[PDB]
Amino acid sequence: AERMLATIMFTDIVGSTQHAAALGDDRWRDLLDNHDTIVCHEIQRFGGREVNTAGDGFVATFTSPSAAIACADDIVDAVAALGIEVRIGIHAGEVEVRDASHGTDVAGVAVHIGARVCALAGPSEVLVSSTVRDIVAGSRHRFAERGEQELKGVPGRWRLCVLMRDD
Amino acid sequence: AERMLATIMFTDIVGSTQHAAALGDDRWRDLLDNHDTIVCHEIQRFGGREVNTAGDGFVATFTSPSAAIACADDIVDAVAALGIEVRIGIHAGEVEVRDASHGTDVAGVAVHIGARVCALAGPSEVLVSSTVRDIVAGSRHRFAERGEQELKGVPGRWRLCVLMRDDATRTR
Numbered sequence: 001a002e003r004m005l006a007t008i009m010f011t012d013i014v015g016s017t018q019h020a021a022a023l024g025d026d027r028w029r030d031l032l033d034n035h036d037t038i039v040c041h042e043i044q045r046f047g048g049r050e051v052n053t054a055g056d057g058f059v060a061t062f063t064s065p066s067a068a069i070a071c072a073d074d075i076v077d078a079v080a081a082l083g084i085e086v087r088i089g090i091h092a093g094e095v096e097v098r099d100a101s102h103g104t105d106v107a108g109v110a111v112h113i114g115a116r117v118c119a120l121a122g123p124s125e126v127l128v129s130s131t132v133r134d135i136v137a138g139s140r141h142r143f144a145e146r147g148e149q150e151l152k153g154v155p156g157r158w159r160l161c162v163l164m165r166d167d
Numbered sequence: 168a169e170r171m172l173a174t175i176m177f178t179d180i181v182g183s184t185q186h187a188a189a190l191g192d193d194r195w196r197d198l199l200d201n202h203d204t205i206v207c208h209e210i211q212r213f214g215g216r217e218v219n220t221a222g223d224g225f226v227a228t229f230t231s232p233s234a235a236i237a238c239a240d241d242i243v244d245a246v247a248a249l250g251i252e253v254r255i256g257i258h259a260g261e262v263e264v265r266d267a268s269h270g271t272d273v274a275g276v277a278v279h280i281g282a283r284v285c286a287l288a289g290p291s292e293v294l295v296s297s298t299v300r301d302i303v304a305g306s307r308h309r310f311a312e313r314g315e316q317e318l319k320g321v322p323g324r325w326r327l328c329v330l331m332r333d334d335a336t337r338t339r
Contacts, residue, residue, distance in 0.1 A: 001196075017276055017322065025170075054219040054272030102269045107223055109184060119320065153286065155184065 007065040007092045010118035012057040014085040046071035052103045065135045072126040089118030091129040116151040126163035133161045174232040174259040177285035178225040181252040213238035218273045232302045239293045256285025257295040297326035311338040
């Protein structure tokens with residue numbers, strides 16, 4: 001039950017429901033194994049830790065916010081290989097951490113904000129909270145700042161920033 | 168990873184944020200423990216199974232839809248005895264159930280729907296989807312039409328219904 005500052009990355013497959021319906025269980029399970037293997041390797045690669053969820057998408061923490069951004073950037077291109085797109089949100093805040101041997105669980109308002117940012121992210125986009133932009137002030141990363149808004153179900157007003165990618 | 172038709176109940180503490188900051192961590196952690204015990208004893212009494220342990224809200228599946236409704240109805244009252252209120256959403260749909268020995272997880276559109284129904288419910292209110300109302304057609308449970316939300320980010324039209332409890336119920 002540790003209070004900690006963490007960078008959390010949330011990812012989700014765009015149109016998972018329709019891919020599963022168009023491909024059928026057999027082919028969908030395949031794509032989902034390809035996606036997971038890919039995403040899990042990328043996370044390991046950049047030093048992240050998968051933190052528990054039962055909800056199809058991925059959630060992982062990183063001791064480095066720069067690592068989280070670079071990891072997200074790479075995941076978007078890597079999964080594109082499978083013909084699907086992914087949406088990604090990154091946020092940093094204090095969260096309650098609990099690391100069992102069954103995995104690590106993370107909770108708190110910061111976790112809800114992260115999931116919210118992910119939902120507001122477009123296909124193949126890496127959307128970040130201004131908190132994360134601020135944290136990596138000075139890094140090589142560039143952002144386009146969208147307007148301020150309230151993430152309903154959360155205290156305060158948030159400005160969201162899109163990562164300037166390359167392609 | 169089997170595909171099934173299940174009834175899912177979602178619960179959540181109203182104003183947990185302000186309540187936690189107001190009490191401090193020790194006291195809050197204690198109130199949550201009592202909440203969890205009560206909610207859990209209730210789910211067990213009605214034959215439910217806790218699922219997706221991540222997050223501090225409660226999610227449970229029931230073989231019997233009427234039992235999930237009766238359980239929500241009881242949890243609302245039982246929690247009040249602690250000075251807090253909960254909002255509960257209930258939906259039924261086809262989901263992907265995966266059984267590991269570290270707990271059971273559920274996934275699917277149905278699960279998103281349920282989580283959404285809960286978020287829309289008010290304090291001490293049990294909100295369900297039209298599907299749940301139709302499934303228990305002819306039971307003692309009564310519902311009031313609460314309108315038709317769109318539940319975005321997921322397919323469908325979707326009509327919500329509030330459970331008529333032995334207490335003031337919204338939608339009139």
